């Protein structure tokens, strides 16, 4: 457990924190906007996961300024996490 494992390990933990907080903040931001569908927590968590994994079906998405702002954080933290693990497994193989 040097640096190339603690980084990916913390990123995975941080990601889960972002997913939980992101789904919570999304509901807070999306409510008050007529037509918004991202207004309940259980499906907001499902949205955050498919957002952080860059899947993004289209069944759920933010339509507000702060809602979309929260979404961007979920994307970046998502790509970084899934990208930091990739760079982690790369360094592992290089050192044999």
């Amino acid at each position: 457990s040097a640096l190339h494992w603690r980084a990916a390990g913390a990123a995975t933990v941080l990601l889960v924190i972002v997913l939980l907080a992101g789904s919570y903040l999304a509901v807070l931001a999306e409510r008050g906007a007529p037509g918004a569908q991202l207004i309940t927590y259980p499906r907001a968590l499902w949205w955050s996961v498919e957002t952080a994994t860059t899947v993004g079906y289209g069944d759920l998405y933010p339509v507000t300024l702060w809602g979309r702002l929260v979404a961007v954080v979920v994307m970046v933290a998502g790509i970084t996490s899934f990208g930091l693990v990739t760079a982690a497994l790369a360094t592992w193989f290089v050192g044999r």
Partner: antibody, heavy 118, light 108 residues
Framework: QVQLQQPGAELVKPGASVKLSCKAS????????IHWVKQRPGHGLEWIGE????????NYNEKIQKKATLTADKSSSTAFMQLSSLTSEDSAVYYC???????????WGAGTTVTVSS | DILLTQSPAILSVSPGERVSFSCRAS??????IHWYQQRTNGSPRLLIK???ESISGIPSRFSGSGSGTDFTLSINSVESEDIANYYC?????????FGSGTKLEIKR
């Protein structure tokens, strides 16, 4: 036990104001939403607004006249609805309901019969 | 805003007979509909959540069905304690909206 305690009635003069309360009991999570529903006699249920005590943000029904201002108190776990400048059209039973942030209203209050008269 | 229409407004039925209430949305809301009950001088009581999912405490007679725009609340063999107003409420899009309500009437 009763999870939402509301005052029995509140007499208001035309043009004055009143502050209804909604004391909560039982499990009070941080993801709880407190809603307020207006019901005139002979009519149906009418959504007024919502508020999450944790953050303090409140939303209101834009389809009707903005006359209610939702506030909360995390200390005593009670929700408040400030009705301003009431007329004869505002005389109704005002319920309060707890939502777990999953859509439905699990528990309703007994309702506060607000009467606007001189 | 999503409009919720309940037809008819009044529903007459003989005792021990199956009855069905109707709730139609102006647009597709999936299964995000909820049924409530309100007797005379009483507060609304959650009967069914999410179209068909039952609530603990509510008798077995109360069932739920429907998806998209059309939804139905059913009572298997209606008895006298079911005399009340039945409302439907959606939670698919903000803001939440209620139905016009349907009053159950038993002809004895």
């Amino acid at each position: 036990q009763v999870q939402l305690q509301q005052p029995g009635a509140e007499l208001v003069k035309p043009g004055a104001s009143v502050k209804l309360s909604c004391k909560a009991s039982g499990y009070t999570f941080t993801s709880d939403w407190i809603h307020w529903v207006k019901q005139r006699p002979g009519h149906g249920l009418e959504w007024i607004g919502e508020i999450i005590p944790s953050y303090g943000r409140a939303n209101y029904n834009e389809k009707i006249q903005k006359k209610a201002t939702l506030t909360a108190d995390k200390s005593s776990s009670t929700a408040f609805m400030q009705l301003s400048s009431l007329t004869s059209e505002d005389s109704a039973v005002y319920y309060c309901a707890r939502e777990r942030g999953d859509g439905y209203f699990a528990v309703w209050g007994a309702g506060t019969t607000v009467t606007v008269s001189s | 805003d999503i409009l919720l229409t309940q037809s008819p407004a009044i529903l007459s039925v003989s005792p021990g007979e199956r009855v069905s209430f109707s709730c139609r949305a102006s647009q597709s809301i999936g299964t995000d509909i909820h049924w409530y009950q309100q007797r005379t001088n009483g507060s609304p009581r959650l009967l069914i959540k999410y179209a068909s999912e039952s609530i603990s405490g509510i008798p077995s007679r109360f069932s739920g069905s429907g998806s998209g725009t059309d939804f139905t609340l059913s009572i298997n063999s209606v008895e006298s304690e079911d005399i009340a107003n039945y409302y439907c409420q959606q939670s698919n899009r903000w803001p939440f909206t209620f139905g016009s309500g349907t009053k159950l009437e038993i002809k004895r």
